[PDB]
Design a protein around this nucleic acid. Structure first.
Ligand SMILES: [Mg+2]
Ligand SMILES: [Mg+2]
Ligand SMILES: [Mg+2]
Ligand SMILES: [Mg+2]
Ligand SMILES: [Mg+2]
Ligand SMILES: [Mg+2]
Ligand SMILES: [Mg+2]
Ligand SMILES: [Mg+2]
Ligand SMILES: [Mg+2]
Ligand SMILES: [Mg+2]
Ligand SMILES: [Mg+2]
Ligand SMILES: [Mg+2]
Ligand SMILES: [Mg+2]
Ligand SMILES: [Mg+2]
Ligand SMILES: [Mg+2]
Ligand SMILES: [Mg+2]
Ligand SMILES: [Mg+2]
Ligand SMILES: [Mg+2]
Ligand SMILES: [Mg+2]
Ligand SMILES: [Mg+2]
Ligand SMILES: [Mg+2]
Ligand SMILES: [Mg+2]
Ligand SMILES: [Mg+2]
Ligand SMILES: [Mg+2]
Ligand SMILES: [Mg+2]
Ligand SMILES: [Mg+2]
Ligand SMILES: [Mg+2]
Ligand SMILES: [Mg+2]
Ligand SMILES: [Mg+2]
Ligand SMILES: [Mg+2]
Ligand SMILES: [Zn+2]
Lengths: 306, 152, 146, 115, 108
RNA sequence: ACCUCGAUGUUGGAUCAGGACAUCCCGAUGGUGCAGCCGCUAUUAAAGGUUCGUUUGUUCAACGAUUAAAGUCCUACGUGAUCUGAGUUCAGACCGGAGUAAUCCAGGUCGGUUUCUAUCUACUUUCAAAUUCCUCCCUGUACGAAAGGACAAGAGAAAUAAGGCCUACUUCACAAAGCGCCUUCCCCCGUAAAUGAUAUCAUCUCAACUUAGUAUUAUACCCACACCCACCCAAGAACAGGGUU
RNA sequence: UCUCUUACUUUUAACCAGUGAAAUUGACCUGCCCGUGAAGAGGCGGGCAUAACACAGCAAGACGAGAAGACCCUAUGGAGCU
RNA sequence: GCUACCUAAGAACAGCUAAAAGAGCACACCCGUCUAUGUAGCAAAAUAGUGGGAAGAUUUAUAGGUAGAGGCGACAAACCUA
């Protein structure tokens, strides 16, 4: 029968680096070709509407750095770097669920040797290197964006609450006290094998247990959505987002940041680019860092109280 | 939960583990070839790399001398390590101690492996040599490379 | 980056936790630059109050930045045996406590049982910082030049 | 954190905390939803077998960043209504209690040193 | 714990004949360019391994016969030889350990 | 004494909760022997809490300090194949009594072994749309003779539970936790009132209708059928999950 | 001991190699609610429920396993004490 | 021959304080008040300390005697080969 095989099996000692360099140059050229999407064949841009939404971005959680404001308080911001972010395809309204349109957005770039055949065919037909994960954002109809455009981290501006969701750090099969937070029996008070036992689970008259009973098992290996994350600083050169609070997940992982749907922040994106921030048609160069009117800039000459 | 933590436990604690690793390192310095489980030979190679580095850093240093006297319980291996294995890798940095995997043992059927230093007066182990540069795929790759070189 | 300053004010120990990078900090001034035999003075809470008591209106002494930073080899006594932490354990590695006028020989003999001679020769746990130091030094030089 | 049954030392110049007694004054209740007391909270202190309120002016655990860390639990006595008991406070009082200015106006006025 | 009844042979068959407990068929078995005694991917051949182990054992026997007693460890490198083969010029300071058989084709 | 002496473990407490109102509260009404904050009556609503302690052996019972409360019943007087017997179901003894003695005590006390490898059903994040206290201008205003203090709105600080983090505090270190940090968004049916005949007045309607008077036919994680020897991993019991340019 | 638990090592825990139990078993193709019955139903009536098969943990039920109950009662069946 | 008692000949108890002692701490030794582990276990009665004694009412090697309507008993109806 057919045995297992990979890409560097039937290659000599002078062909593996050649193939690596060739595929590296190929993916670099493919990434550089999709740099100016506005000069090609862009879709018509529609004005901003109060009853519409937009597409989010995909970032990578670097680390967590402290941050101070002007009033003297100390906050905490999380670094979200956007390496490569593009649009895969576009699904119409009458093809998904008949409610809202969707957009396929991929994460960072990877290799073409550890992917499925259909994935490679799709990324070859589209013209972009394969990605790690694929996310879907629910948008409206007038926010239709042509697939194949670069998405930078400058799409968000300091002064907007966003929502970041990712896969949390899994704890595996753990006990119930560390999972659900149940109290435990005393220690050396004559206890005989019951320091971390839940005890009862149900009653004697029902003859069974309820499915909604908190019992030990796997916990942490799931995606959690975080709400109320205000941005305080937007970077342009390195494309770093400074979201306040914590991001559910570990370090060096792909997240999914988008606009918030809370009722307190309904129509607050009128001063924001509804389609996508294009560095070609803006006719202006944004600064390296975009600060807020409340965060203490590093170049401050020692703020003093009066 | 053991995230980002190595240090594979073997004996009855850290002291026994360090003693076993020191014995394995002494045996590897002496015989230059030892068959043992994959974790044991991996830790032995990881410690032997730093041992070779410290022996190459110098001889008159008291720190390296104390480390060699501690990690070698045979005494006679210290001059050998300082006057043979140190001048040998004077042109190399951290590229040595090649690890090769063997099948299993005829006793309890455990995964083992054999490591050794470079050079080695003993005959070399049968290295998994790759395919020759004359097969169909290799010839096609060479032709494509020559074509892209002549077209550039 | 934070640091704790120990000082006795009117017979009361006050420990402030400043920040090296905080917008509220005005100016950091060094009064007396000197080293000691320990890199962590957390054992001053169980010592005599006269050692951790310094004058608040003292005049800073000025010297040249080429004296190799003189190290003050001064030993500090300790209060009886209701201490805060077990400083006699070998894992702390403290060479600034007078164990001759505070503890007996049997206490030291029974405390030396937790000594780990194998930890000093762990090798793999050693953090060799050289290339990273050179890189950050080149970076700070390039940032200071232009 | 000053909870309950804690041997605290009075740092006031009154006739209750400065008087010697065979039992050290210990707290029995904290006027808060939880059983955790920080600097600037009202607690009940039993001095010489009595029931009098107290005010936490400095515990021993490090709270935030810009805050002092005293080695001993400093507590200034207080009555029901806002009238302090002692008249001379020799121990230093942190500047974190000056953000009130309404319920502890006399306690901050009878103090001396501030850190 | 104590069962109230008895498991059937059908339950035993469903438990022991499931594909999860059955041994999986591996597809990593190939041939070897040399000798050829049925090897496996990422695993060295047992035939050449036994050969080199026997050769190393013979070399160690010869070294122990030349050294004699324990606690030696010379401060110079070593080099093994076979039938004939005069020592080269760059092998003067190395210990010479000659054997009593022809030189194999897999040792250069 | 109706299955249960070829065996139904008996009071509490720790952990875990489910259901019900004959409801302490925040949600919404009418009256008052309701002058305003303190009270009572009758209705709908269970999404939660029901504290910190002492001693007596307690589910009983006694006393100190809070807010809206330290609520009730059933679940084998819930839960000993999870935990302890402080007594309650023995063999010893002491005090007092009945008894010739032996012996006994719903009279009291000292201590009095707590055994099971999960066979079967069933479980192993149900992904989520919280609750509330205080203060500030109104507030010292209606009100009494005086004490005193709101109805409602805006803003700022806070308590329990849930969803995450190590970079700043701690446990002490190539990691993981809290003592540190962020967020938690919608209601729930009982009245107050126009026109109208039956019943030409009047009539809020188990008539045909109009206002608070129904939130919602809500929104985000996650939705590519197959390259898999081997190595690594913030993924993990195996398996499974991700990367190897 | 707790508020509020936590950082590590061993036994032990999960898989690989073999010797390999004990108690226990009427047969099981073995889900839930309401109601009934020798009075507490996975096998009875009406409904809800349903492709099949293993691994890793807890006890709610099968009035689960060990002792023809030591507590209450019968026996013209016994024995000890006075 | 384990255990209650008796008989004849022997052995054992570092060190310090030794108040003269059926004195104290404390090795070896005699017994086992409590915690933790298992109750088809190492064991049909185990594992460390917290324990009392350890110059004498102490322990032990050898040999003999007291047996059921009885032996023995510093009296537990305790022991008389699980
Ligand atoms: Mg606990
Ligand atoms: Mg225990
Ligand atoms: Mg037990
Ligand atoms: Mg092991
Ligand atoms: Mg302490
Ligand atoms: Mg009956
Ligand atoms: Mg019965
Ligand atoms: Mg039965
Ligand atoms: Mg039974
Ligand atoms: Mg009701
Ligand atoms: Mg209590
Ligand atoms: Mg009960
Ligand atoms: Mg039960
Ligand atoms: Mg039990
Ligand atoms: Mg007792
Ligand atoms: Mg199972
Ligand atoms: Mg069953
Ligand atoms: Mg096995
Ligand atoms: Mg019938
Ligand atoms: Mg029933
Ligand atoms: Mg049945
Ligand atoms: Mg019977
Ligand atoms: Mg009769
Ligand atoms: Mg008879
Ligand atoms: Mg008869
Ligand atoms: Mg008789
Ligand atoms: Mg006797
Ligand atoms: Mg004596
Ligand atoms: Mg004694
Ligand atoms: Mg008697
Ligand atoms: Zn071969």
């Amino acid at each position: 029968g057919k045995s297992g095989t990979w890409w560097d099996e039937h290659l000599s000692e002078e062909n593996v680096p050649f193939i690596k360099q060739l595929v590296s140059d190929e993916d670099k050229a493919q990434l550089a070709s999709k740099l100016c999407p506005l000069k090609d064949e862009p879709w018509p841009i529609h004005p901003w509407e109060p009853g519409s939404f937009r597409v989010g971005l995909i970032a990578l959680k670097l680390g967590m750095m402290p941050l101070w404001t002007k009033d003297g308080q100390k906050h905490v911001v999380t670094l979200l770097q956007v390496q490569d972010c593009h649009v895969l395809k576009y699904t119409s309204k009458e093809n998904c669920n008949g409610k809202m349109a969707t957009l396929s957005v991929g994460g960072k770039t990877v290799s073409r040797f550890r992917k499925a055949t259909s994935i490679l065919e799709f990324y070859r037909e589209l013209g972009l290197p394969p990605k790690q994960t694929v996310k879907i954002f629910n948008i409206t109809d007038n926010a239709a964006i042509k697939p194949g455009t670069p998405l930078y981290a400058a799409h968000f501006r300091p002064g907007q609450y966003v929502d970041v969701t990712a896969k949390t750090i899994g704890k595996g099969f753990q006990g119930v006290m560390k999972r659900w937070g149940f109290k435990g029996q005393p220690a050396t008070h004559g206890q005989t094998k019951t320091h971390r036992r839940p005890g009862a689970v149900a009653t004697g008259d029902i003859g069974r247990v309820w499915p909604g009973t908190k019992m030990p098992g796997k916990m942490g290996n799931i995606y959690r959505t975080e709400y109320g994350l205000k941005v305080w600083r937007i970077n342009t050169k390195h494309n770093i987002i400074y979201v306040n609070g914590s991001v559910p997940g570990h370090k060096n992982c792909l997240v999914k940041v988008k606009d918030s749907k809370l009722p307190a922040y309904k129509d607050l994106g009128k001063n924001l680019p509804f389609p996508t921030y294009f560095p070609d048609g803006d006719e202006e160069e944004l600064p390296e860092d975009l600060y807020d009117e409340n965060v203490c800039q590093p170049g401050a000459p020692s703020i003093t109280f009066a | 939960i053991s995230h980002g933590r190595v240090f594979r436990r073997m004996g009855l604690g850290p002291e026994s583990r360090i003693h076993l690793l020191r014995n394995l390192l002494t045996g590897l310095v002496r015989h230059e070839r030892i068959e043992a489980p994959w974790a044991r030979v991996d830790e032995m190679r990881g410690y032997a790399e730093k041992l070779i580095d410290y022996g190459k850093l110098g001889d008159t240093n008291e720190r390296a001398m104390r480390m060699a006297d501690f990690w070698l319980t045979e005494k006679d291996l210290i001059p050998k390590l300082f006057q043979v294995l140190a001048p040998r890798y004077k042109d190399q940095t951290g590229g040595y101690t090649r690890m090769l995997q063997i099948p299993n043992r005829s006793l309890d059927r455990a995964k083992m492996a054999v490591i050794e230093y470079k050079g080695n007066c003993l005959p070399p182990l049968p290295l998994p040599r790759r395919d020759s540069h004359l097969t169909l795929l290799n010839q096609l790759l060479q032709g494509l490379r020559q074509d892209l070189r002549q077209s550039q | 980056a934070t640091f704790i300053l120990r000082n006795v004010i009117e017979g009361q120990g006050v420990e402030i936790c400043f920040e090296l990078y905080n917008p509220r900090v005005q100016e950091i001034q060094v009064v007396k630059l000197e080293k000691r035999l320990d890199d962590s003075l957390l054992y001053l809470r169980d010592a005599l109050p006269e050692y951790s008591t310094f004058d608040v209106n003292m005049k800073p002494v000025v010297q040249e930045p080429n004296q190799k930073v003189p190290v003050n080899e001064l030993k500090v006594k300790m209060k009886p045996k209701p201490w805060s932490k077990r400083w006699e354990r070998p894992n702390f590695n403290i060479k600034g406590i007078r164990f001759d006028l505070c503890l007996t020989e049997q206490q030291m003999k029974e405390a030396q049982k937790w000594n780990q001679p194998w930890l000093e020769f762990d090798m793999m746990r050693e953090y060799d910082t050289s290339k990273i130091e050179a890189a950050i030094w080149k970076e700070i030089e390039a940032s200071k030049r232009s | 954190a000053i909870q309950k049954m804690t041997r605290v030392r009075v740092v006031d110049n009154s006739a209750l905390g400065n008087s010697p007694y065979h039992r050290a004054p210990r707290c029995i209740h904290v006027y808060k939803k939880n059983g955790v007391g920080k600097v600037g909270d009202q607690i009940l202190l039993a001095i010489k077998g009595q029931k009098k309120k107290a005010l936490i002016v400095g515990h021993c655990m490090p709270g935030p960043r810009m805050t002092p860390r005293f080695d001993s639990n400093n507590v200034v006595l207080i009555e029901d209504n806002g009238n302090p008991v002692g008249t001379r406070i020799k121990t230093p009082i942190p500047t974190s209690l000056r953000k009130r200015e309404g319920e502890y106006s006399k306690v901050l006025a009878i103090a001396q040193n501030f850190v | 714990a104590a069962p109230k009844n008895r498991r059937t042979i059908e339950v035993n068959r469903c438990r022991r004949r499931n594909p999860q407990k059955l041994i999986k068929v591996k597809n990593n078995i190939d041939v070897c360019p040399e000798c050829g005694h049925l090897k496996q991917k990422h695993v060295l051949c047992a035939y050449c391994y036994e050969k080199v182990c026997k050769e190393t054992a013979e070399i160690r026997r010869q070294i122990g016969k030349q050294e004699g007693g324990p606690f030696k460890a010379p401060t110079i490198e070593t080099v093994v030889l076979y039938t004939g083969e005069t020592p080269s010029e760059q092998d003067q300071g190395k210990r010479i350990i000659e054997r009593d058989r022809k030189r194999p084709s897999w040792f250069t």
